[PDB]
Amino acid sequence: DEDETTALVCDNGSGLVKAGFAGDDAPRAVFPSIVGRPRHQGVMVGMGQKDSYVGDEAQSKRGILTLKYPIEHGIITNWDDMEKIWHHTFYNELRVAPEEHPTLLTEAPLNPKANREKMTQIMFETFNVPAMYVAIQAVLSLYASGRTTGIVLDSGDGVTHNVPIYEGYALPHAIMRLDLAGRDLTDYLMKILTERGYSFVTTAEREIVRDIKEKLCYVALDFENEMATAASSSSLEKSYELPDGQVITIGNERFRCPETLFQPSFIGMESAGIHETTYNSIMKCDIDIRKDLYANNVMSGGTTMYPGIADRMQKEITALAPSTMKIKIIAPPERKYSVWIGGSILASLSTFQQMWITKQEYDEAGPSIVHRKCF
Amino acid sequence: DEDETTALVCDNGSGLVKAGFAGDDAPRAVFPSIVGRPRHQGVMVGMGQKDSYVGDEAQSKRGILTLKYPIEHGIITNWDDMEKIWHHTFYNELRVAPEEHPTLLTEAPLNPKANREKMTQIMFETFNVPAMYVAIQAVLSLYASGRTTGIVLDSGDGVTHNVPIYEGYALPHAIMRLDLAGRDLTDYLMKILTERGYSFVTTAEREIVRDIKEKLCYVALDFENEMATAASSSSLEKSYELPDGQVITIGNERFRCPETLFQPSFIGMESAGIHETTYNSIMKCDIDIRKDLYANNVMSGGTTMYPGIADRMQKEITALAPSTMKIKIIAPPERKYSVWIGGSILASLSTFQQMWITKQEYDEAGPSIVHRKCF
Amino acid sequence: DEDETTALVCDNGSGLVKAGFAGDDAPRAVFPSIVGRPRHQGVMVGMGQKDSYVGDEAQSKRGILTLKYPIEHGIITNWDDMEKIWHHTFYNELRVAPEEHPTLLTEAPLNPKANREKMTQIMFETFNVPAMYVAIQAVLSLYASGRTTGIVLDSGDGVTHNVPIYEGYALPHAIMRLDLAGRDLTDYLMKILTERGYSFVTTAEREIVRDIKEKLCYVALDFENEMATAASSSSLEKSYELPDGQVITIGNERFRCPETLFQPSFIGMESAGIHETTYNSIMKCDIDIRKDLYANNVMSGGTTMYPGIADRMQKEITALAPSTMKIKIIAPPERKYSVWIGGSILASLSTFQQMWITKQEYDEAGPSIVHRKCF
Amino acid sequence: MDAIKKKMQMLKLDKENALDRAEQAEADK
Amino acid sequence: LSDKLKEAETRAEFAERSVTKLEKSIDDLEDELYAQKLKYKAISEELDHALNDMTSI
Amino acid sequence: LSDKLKEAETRAEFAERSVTKLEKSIDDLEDELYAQKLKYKAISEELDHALNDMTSI
């Protein structure tokens, strides 16, 4: 329905699928990266019924479906379910067809190469896209925030990346890829809500908990003080209404979950927290770099939207950092969806139109070509 | 009358047998599930007089017959009597020979397998039906009611199964079978009417009480309040005229019979009732199913005729059901006939013509085939 | 009647209670977790008759009692009924007053906080216990088995918790709580015995089916081949004698029941089974932990007594596990009594005397103290 | 409090920047 | 009795049609009620929490 | 006809009773509901009105 061959831009993560066209300032539509399948035997005849449901269809009919996410902490493994997600994203939402548009997809700098190769292969072989470009999420995160220099803190559902970039250059030895993410927070919250007498173990229950987290959770600037009062009084409790009419009242779990970002040991992770990884990624850089990176810690992705998160990390980084120098976190409202915006910025740059893999070079070389053409 | 080789449809319980041609909205013939036999020595000769009487014949000449039914708490125990009932219903009343028509018979999903095997065997071996299918009673009740989703509370004569279905799929782990039905309600009434001075123990007498129940009883929206008045005032007694011109008046007993549906302890059963099973079947369904089943709890079969039952049930379920959610009971006109109607709807679907067991597959495998071919 | 002030050990579950004195090798008082109540109107007078019956009393007079279990899916839902079970177990059978015997109770690692604090409160305020401790069943299972490392599969009546321990330390991030247990296997059997013509719904019937399951059911090493013959011939059928002299003959239901452990979809559960959860408890632990947990897969609690289960599990985990690696199951004849044995070992351990909460600390802090003092 | 969410960001950023300037203005010596 | 019945059936059916409409009014009313409660709850709570977290300005 | 009339009259009464019972529960619903309806939005509305001003600092 577009009147120009604008690139399509999409962030296909372990959580949400964000999509729109290059040149806009927001995805046109956002939905979960879900393909659902019936877990029951049908008994009525002439009921239609799909073998599998996609995106909002998967959630709408979820009462009898098991729901799977094709992307595992940033990498695509179930490419067949992702073909369905892309087809839905492009044709039933954006009303575009990749065949008529070049397409940009994105991944973290230390994401296994298999992800970039499979995304390239499917868009060229099943969607016949005229061109492809796998972008770096860190590049897109700083484009959207307006920086050439800073730390990308992309703390979303899949993985936290923690990468320093200076004057548009990577400083890769200082990347602290961390297995701590929004996805772990959903499962951790299911376990601490079990402690309160409300057990959650199934897909429907997981989707309920993801909704509780997204609507009730925060981290707070001072954890121990927030904990002491939440654990002592109903004044810091907040209720949540479940799809079936049940009501759950949540106290310190409201922040104890999110606090795992600063205390990863809560989920058994060997980590000092996201503020230390930010700190060390800067400390491993030269001193004429550090002055600019400490003043530009930049948030992207989910969990960055929690109350107290920018202040919590800035406080800890500042405490670890030397004096005189200023430490600051950049945390714009275009949060959680800013990498998509960065994709639009990259896709539309005049300096980027020579970076595309065309569907000529692709067939001559095969999908491994992405490893040499994109970055 | 029929001018096409349509499927025949026939619902068979411990109460009555409903039959007709697929594509209609009603059975064209309804007979009691009864075979009668004389219990007296004949003295006059040249009097005709049968060895056995079936359906309406059994009731019309019942003054000297003992009356027995072939189906107990959902299953066929006497296949010979079912053959007589179907022979009469199909050949004498509907004027159809099943040899030229596929036939659809029904049962709930937990019905012991012998029942499905007998239904299949009788129609293939004594009627030579070209094809068979055994359908789920809950499936047919939802078709008749205009639903794909809902819980079917089949409070018939034999057994109540209360089977939940979502998007046309079985949720079998949640079927809460209950040993309470219309036949037990009749027995309760016979005992309480004995307390009033009217003993009813022989066949003619048992038929009278069943008729009294069907015409005089109601559930009572408020049992205790209805009883406080009914037990205190004769103005609430209803007079029933007995076949010999004598009368019986019934007071609070008028509602204490159907009250067993809310008080199974009245007949010695370890259960709270039909509203308890309605609640437990939904309670065990997936948390993202519950909202659609609670808004669509479905009455099916008989005993639903009680002009007290419509409000009594919604009050009893609403009282147990979650807040926020709309709680509703569907009490359609297609009651007491919903399975037959659903049978017509299923039997006539184009999508159902591939579901038939043919009289080829049947003879190669035998009647156990129904267990693999129907559901 | 004991000669030492030794703590009692009381493994109180959703099924049965194994109680005895710490320092011994076996429980002395074994009762079902049942409180029974009459459901009939009395006619004779001077018949004694209790308001409630407990343990063996509840089963011995069960012909007219409705039997309830105060514990469900790992927690106490009715603590007043547990006081009745405990009073009998302690004073009539073990013949001990808790006042001089601290008593160790058991729980699962992710068991709701409310249960651990309520157990603490009853023993301190109703029984005046001088001290309390609530133990982890996985800890007790490993002590009984002679290990500090392994996966404890505590597969009893309530919940399967799937919890890993390494070098005596919990690895809580890898606990896979599963909503599949022995109580569900009993319910499944009642439904498929209904398919065979033997419906079981009432208390007497529920107790019979549990007894049938315990005596007749098994898993073996190959479900499909076992089913192919069980479904084809009487040679794999086993008869069970019902209390009134009647019998029930059971075929493939004998294995289809416990197969739910490997196929949870049989009861409508969204799960891949107990071997997937065992595998994930091992797999989700660090790579240098995995080897020791693979070699120490520990069977504990109920259902571990299904024929073929220890080897069935080793096979099913091996099938998911990397090659070369040795997967081993620990399954001594002291199976299921291992939690009690560990309770004895821990309660009497000199290194654990300081772990008891005394009735000083209890009143100063209240029952929530168990959460901070036991582990 | 949408008005606050943004005014909050505005004032925290503006005071932090003004404070950073106050501190540097003296600290530079 | 037929006329009384037609009138009684008219009243029973009138009232049944009317009660159906009223039942619909209740279903709608409760949904409206929930909207009032849910929006109220959401507003009162989003402010208690917005002000409890957004305290520093 | 007598039985149908008694049933229809009984149902005329029950259905009309259900109608006046629901008209009443609906009024008693709606009236109490409008209270919520008029105060939940006015409280939240005036809270939001006040917020525009509360935030003018």
Instruction: Give all domains of chain C, ordered by start, each with its CATH number.
Output: 4-34+71-134+337-371 (3.30.420.40), 35-68 (2.30.36.70), 136-181+271-332 (3.30.420.40), 182-267 (3.90.640.10)
Chain F positions in Cβ-Cβ contact with residue D4 (cut-off 8 Å):
55
Neighbours of chain A (3+ CB pairs under 8 A): B, C, D, E
Give the span between the Cα atoms of A347 and A127, in whole angstroms: 19
DSSP character string of A249-287: EESTHHHHTGGGGT-GGGGT-----HHHHHHHHHHTS-H
The packing angle between helices A79-87 and A113-125, to 10°, is 50
Q: Which residue has the tokens 């595992």?
A: A72
Contact of D1 with chain F, judged by CB distance below 8 Å, is answered with: yes
Closest by alpha carbon to A213, among A180, A155, A255? A255
Give the span between the Cα atoms of A128 and A363, in whole angstroms: 11
Q: Which residue has the tokens 């399951």?
A: C213
Chain B positions in Cβ-Cβ contact with residue E38 (cut-off 8 Å):
324
DSSP state of B332: -
Question: Closest to E45 (Cβ–Cβ): which among A218, A220, A238?
Answer: A238
Phi-psi region of C146 (alpha: psi -120 to 50; beta: other; left: phi over 0): left
CA E37 to chain A, closest CA, distance in angstroms equals 12
C268/B173 Cβ within 8 A: yes
| Cα separation values, A304 from A157, A225, A276, B306, F9, Å | 11, 21, 16, 59, 67
Give the span between the Cα atoms of A147 and A143, in whole angstroms: 6
| Contacting residues for C238 by C-beta, under 8 A, at least 6 apart | C216, C249, C250, C254
Q: Tell me the β-bridge partners of B249.
A: B239
Opening angle at CA B45, ends B43 and B47, nearest 5? 105
The answer to whether the beta carbons of residues A97 and A123 sit under 8 Å apart is no
**H or E element: which one contains C113?**
helix C113-125
Give the span between the Cα atoms of E28 and E20, in whole angstroms: 12
D20/A326 Cβ within 8 A: yes
B322/A246 Cβ within 8 A: yes
Quick count: other Cβ atoms within 10 Å of Cβ F54?
15
Opening angle at CA C164, ends C161 and C169, nearest 5? 125
B139/A204 Cβ within 8 A: no
3-state secondary structure of A76: strand
Give the span between the Cα atoms of F52 and F57, in whole angstroms: 10
CA E41 to chain D, closest CA, distance in angstroms equals 15
Chain E positions in Cβ-Cβ contact with residue F33 (cut-off 8 Å):
29, 32-33, 36
Q: Compute chain D's Rg from CA coordinates.
A: 12
Closest by alpha carbon to E29, among B332, B289, F35, B318? F35
Give the span between the Cα atoms of C62 and A127, in whole angstroms: 68
* Residue B354 burial (10 A CB sphere; 0-12, 13-18, 19+): exposed
CA C176 to chain A, closest CA, distance in angstroms equals 9
DSSP character string of D1-29: -HHHHHHHHHHHHHHHHHHHHHHHHHHT-
Tokens at A372, concatenated:
């040499």
The answer to whether the beta carbons of residues B93 and B29 sit under 8 Å apart is yes
Resolution in A: 8.1
Tell me the CA end-to-end span of chain C in Å, nearest whole number: 32
The answer to whether the beta carbons of residues B103 and B8 sit under 8 Å apart is yes
F11/B307 Cβ within 8 A: yes
Contact of F2 with chain D, judged by CB distance below 8 Å, is answered with: no
Opening angle at CA B245, ends B242 and B248, nearest 5? 45
Tokens at A341, concatenated:
């915006």
Neighbours of chain D (3+ CB pairs under 8 A): A, E, F
Give the span between the Cα atoms of C196 and C190, in whole angstroms: 10
Q: Tell me the β-bridge partners of A37.
A: A66
Opening angle at CA B60, ends B54 and B66, nearest 5? 65
Beta strand B75-76 with A65-68: parallel, antiparallel or unpaired?
Answer: unpaired
Give the span between the Cα atoms of C48 and A295, in whole angstroms: 84
Quick count: other Cβ atoms within 10 Å of Cβ A149?
18
CA of E28: which chain B residue's CA is closest?
B326
Tokens at B303, concatenated:
């005993």
Q: Which of F51, F52, F55 to mutate to test the interface with D (most CBs of D within 10 A)?
A: F55
Tell me the CA end-to-end span of chain A in Å, nearest whole number: 32
CA of D11: which chain F residue's CA is closest?
F57
Instruction: Produce one character per residue of B321-332: b if its CB has 16 or more CB atoms within 10 Å, e if not.
Output: bbebbbbbbbbb
Quick count: other Cβ atoms within 10 Å of Cβ C228?
13
Chain E positions in Cβ-Cβ contact with residue B326 (cut-off 8 Å):
27, 30-31
**Do B and C touch (≥3 CB pairs < 8 Å)?**
yes
Give the span between the Cα atoms of A107 and A111, in whole angstroms: 6
The beta strand positions in chain A, using DSSP E, are 8-12, 16-21, 29-32, 35-38, 53-54, 65-68, 71-72, 75-76, 103-107, 131-136, 150-153, 163-166, 169-170, 238-241, 247-250, 297-299, 329-330, 357-358
Q: Which residue has the tokens 């470009």?
A: A133
Tokens at C276, concatenated:
């997937």
Chain B positions in Cβ-Cβ contact with residue A42 (cut-off 8 Å):
168-170
The answer to whether the beta carbons of residues B250 and B240 sit under 8 Å apart is yes
The answer to whether the beta carbons of residues A371 and A30 sit under 8 Å apart is no
Give the span between the Cα atoms of B69 and B16, in whole angstroms: 9
Question: Closest to F37 (Cβ–Cβ): which among E15, E18, E36?
Answer: E36
CA E52 to chain D, closest CA, distance in angstroms equals 11
Tokens at C324, concatenated:
């070369």
DSSP character string of B280-323: HHHHTS-TTTHHHHHTTEEEESSSTT-TTHHHHHHHHHHTTSPS
C199/B179 Cβ within 8 A: yes
E34/B324 Cβ within 8 A: yes
**If you count them, how many residues does chain E have?**
57
CA E48 to chain D, closest CA, distance in angstroms equals 10
Closest by alpha carbon to C253, among C288, C289, C216, C295? C216
Q: Which residue has the tokens 């008729």?
A: B211
Give the span between the Cα atoms of B213 and B258, in whole angstroms: 9
Chain F positions in Cβ-Cβ contact with residue E5 (cut-off 8 Å):
1, 4-5, 8
Contact of A308 with chain E, judged by CB distance below 8 Å, is answered with: yes
The answer to whether the beta carbons of residues C257 and C213 sit under 8 Å apart is yes
A203/C112 Cβ within 8 A: no
Contact of C172 with chain A, judged by CB distance below 8 Å, is answered with: yes
Give the span between the Cα atoms of B317 and C2, in whole angstroms: 53
**Do A and E touch (≥3 CB pairs < 8 Å)?**
yes
Closest by alpha carbon to A298, among A149, A181, A178? A149
Q: Which residue has the tokens 């009014």?
A: E25
- Which residue intervals of A5-78 are DSSP H helices? 56-60
CA C193 to chain A, closest CA, distance in angstroms equals 20
Sign of torsion over alpha carbons C163, C165, C168, C170: negative
| Contacting residues for C71 by C-beta, under 8 A, at least 6 apart | C12, C13, C14, C33, C77, C82, C158
CA of E37: which chain B residue's CA is closest?
B324
Side chain identity at B233, as an amino acid letter? Answer: S
Chain A positions in Cβ-Cβ contact with residue D16 (cut-off 8 Å):
328
* Residue B77 burial (10 A CB sphere; 0-12, 13-18, 19+): middle
| Contacting residues for C147 by C-beta, under 8 A, at least 6 apart | C296, C298, C330
CA C46 to chain A, closest CA, distance in angstroms equals 45
**Do C and F touch (≥3 CB pairs < 8 Å)?**
no
Neighbours of chain B (3+ CB pairs under 8 A): A, C, E, F
Give the span between the Cα atoms of B249 and B216, in whole angstroms: 10
Give the span between the Cα atoms of A288 and A294, in whole angstroms: 11
CA A143 to chain C, closest CA, distance in angstroms equals 36
**Do E and C touch (≥3 CB pairs < 8 Å)?**
no
Chain A positions in Cβ-Cβ contact with residue D20 (cut-off 8 Å):
326
Contact of A68 with chain C, judged by CB distance below 8 Å, is answered with: no
CA of E30: which chain B residue's CA is closest?
B326
* Residue C215 burial (10 A CB sphere; 0-12, 13-18, 19+): exposed
**Do D and B touch (≥3 CB pairs < 8 Å)?**
no
Quick count: other Cβ atoms within 10 Å of Cβ C227?
17
Query: How far from chain centre, in Å, is Cα C355?
Result: 24
The answer to whether the beta carbons of residues F3 and B215 sit under 8 Å apart is yes
* Residue C226 burial (10 A CB sphere; 0-12, 13-18, 19+): buried
Give the span between the Cα atoms of A39 and A29, in whole angstroms: 28
Q: Tell me the β-bridge partners of B63.
A: none
D1/F51 Cβ within 8 A: yes
Residues of A with CB under 8 A from a CB of D: 324, 326, 328
B311/F11 Cβ within 8 A: no
Phi/psi of residue F34, each to 5°?
Answer: -75, -30
Q: Which residue has the tokens 């993202």?
A: B288
DSSP state of B107: E
The answer to whether the beta carbons of residues C13 and C183 sit under 8 Å apart is no
| Contacting residues for A337 by C-beta, under 8 A, at least 6 apart | A18, A26, A27, A30
| Contacting residues for A138 by C-beta, under 8 A, at least 6 apart | A108, A109, A152, A154, A161, A163, A165, A170
| Cα separation values, E25 from A230, B297, E22, F31, Å | 42, 19, 5, 13
E29/F30 Cβ within 8 A: yes
Beta strand B53-54 with B71-72: parallel, antiparallel or unpaired?
Answer: unpaired
Q: Tell me the β-bridge partners of A11.
A: A18
Give the span between the Cα atoms of C236 and C221, in whole angstroms: 15
Tokens at B77, concatenated:
């125990």
Q: Which residue has the tokens 């190959």?
A: C222
C203/B174 Cβ within 8 A: no
Pairs of residues, one from chain A and one from chain E, whose beta carbons lie less than 8 Å apart: 10
Closest by alpha carbon to B219, among B295, B145, B314, B297? B314
**If you count them, how many residues does chain A have?**
375
Helix, strand, coil distribution of chain E in percent, nearest 5: 90, 0, 10
Phi/psi of residue A278, each to 5°?
Answer: -65, -50
Tokens at C327, concatenated:
């997967």
Query: How far from chain centre, in Å, is Cα B268?
Result: 22
Contact of A241 with chain B, judged by CB distance below 8 Å, is answered with: yes
- Which residue intervals of chain B are DSSP H helices? 56-60, 79-87, 114-125, 137-145, 182-195, 203-216, 223-230, 253-256, 274-283, 290-294, 309-318, 338-347, 361-365, 370-373
